[PDB]
Amino acid sequence: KIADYNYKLPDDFTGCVIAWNSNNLDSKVGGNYNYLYRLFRKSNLKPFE
């Protein structure tokens, strides 16, 4: 659902992805609604609209 859109982790990426096992901290992810991009488009889809 997210591997197939926008940002994955490309070879030319300037950054590190750090993930570790912690059960601390939940919610507050669904506060986004000023960030939306297309699925179906006729006018193209530019990354992270």
Epitope: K1, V29, G30, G31, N32, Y33, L36, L39
Partner: nanobody
Framework: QVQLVESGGGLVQAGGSLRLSCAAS????????MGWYRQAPGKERELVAG????????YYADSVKGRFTISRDNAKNTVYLQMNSLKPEDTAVYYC????????????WGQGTQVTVSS
Amino acid sequence: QVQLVESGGGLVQAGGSLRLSCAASGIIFGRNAMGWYRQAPGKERELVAGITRRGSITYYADSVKGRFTISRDNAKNTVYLQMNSLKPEDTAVYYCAADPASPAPGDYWGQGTQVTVSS
């Protein structure tokens, strides 16, 4: 995705409106809004209608019409799903979920709700 939380449904009459409520994972919750999937043993599973965030503008297929409206209040951060101008052809099992993706027939999203119109 799965384990969606819904309220509403049951028996309503043709015309009027029915307002459903739903809350869900960030995967569903954070997307356009929540629209409708429906199926019945006489009806193929389809995406009914949706929205591109609150406005006068909402969309629906010509396979199943209805100037359905989807909205979010700020009083409680949930999604309200309102179906307007219902007909008996709308009796189906509904799932209240965002338009991208779709429940698998090899999976089951939340509990769902049953809506029956004039029956």
